[PDB]
Amino acid sequence: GITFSKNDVEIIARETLYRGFFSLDLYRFRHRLFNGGMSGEITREIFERGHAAVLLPFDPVRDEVVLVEQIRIAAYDTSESPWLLEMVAGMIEAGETVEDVARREALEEAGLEVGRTKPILSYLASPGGTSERLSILVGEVDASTAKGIHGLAEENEDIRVHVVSREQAYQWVEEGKIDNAASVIALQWLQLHYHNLRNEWTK
């Protein structure tokens, strides 16, 4: 596997390029080379938006998944529609745990009370240009309690809940109808683990 550590990097500076809702910084740095010595000075524009907790709501009794739908305008230029089917998710504030945030966002974004959880994976969304990390859990839910329109009018959020079979959700990944990283990763994980997960949660 890997070889080097943070001691093998010199971050010379992080220079603010843009500050608004999100931020962009120019990282200026040097790093050790595989064949020895230090690199020249490298610069990269890095999009900074904090980090997220993500929850796949799975009903192991019914073999159903709860998805949320809302507009993500950034999807527009490359997608059939900017309304996407997604996992519940939210930012992790200072000092918070993934599990606390995941449970809260499930309740706030989709009205869901989560029972047990298990970790899926924690991933870097696109580390060539953004620092964002997202940590995914699967959360036990009763999919008869998933309903209604959600979102804070204070943040111009408008969210619909969809309850589908696991099989349908995964088929939608295969077909490209679900095609955002968090949901693809979560639903592929679920396809690899659902048998044992249902056993664990219906014992």
Place this chain on the structure above:
Amino acid sequence: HHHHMSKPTQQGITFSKNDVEIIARETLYRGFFSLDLYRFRHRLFNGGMSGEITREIFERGHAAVLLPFDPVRDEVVLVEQIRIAAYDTSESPWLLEMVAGMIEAGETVEDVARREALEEAGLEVGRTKPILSYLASPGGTSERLSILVGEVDASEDIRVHVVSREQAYQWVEEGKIDNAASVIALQWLQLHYHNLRNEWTK
């Protein structure tokens, strides 16, 4: 009829591009990549339209990604290099990744994927098949990455690794491979490798 709506089995998204009006896009920053402000209004689930909304969107183009798989040997090729943006949330910013590159003006996913396999990993690719195409993080960036699996014989400052498929997937499970493109590609491979090995060794 609106009072006898009877499409029970129909599931999926609710609205189309005709249900949103993009009023303007204003560039907030443009260096190499850019940040645009999209100003728009959109239909609401309970009826009507929102007022004008603005969102900041990180614009960095789109990528082609290639999972290099040797179906004869059941091996995967990984490329290792520093990704400084990983620094704040990772023990090391050197990541194990799939080959990938930007799709430039007028280019196709397959051409870019094959080119990057040669330039980034020194690999000549045989057959390719699509894996999946995904939005990296659509709440803040437009970036789409389109993954192919490419048939290889496994025999920037980059180190090329050749590992068993089993080892690569174990590294996903353990968190040693933890970037979206590689996680998605290797999960896909775990779900499809029996069929892919049969298809490519026939």
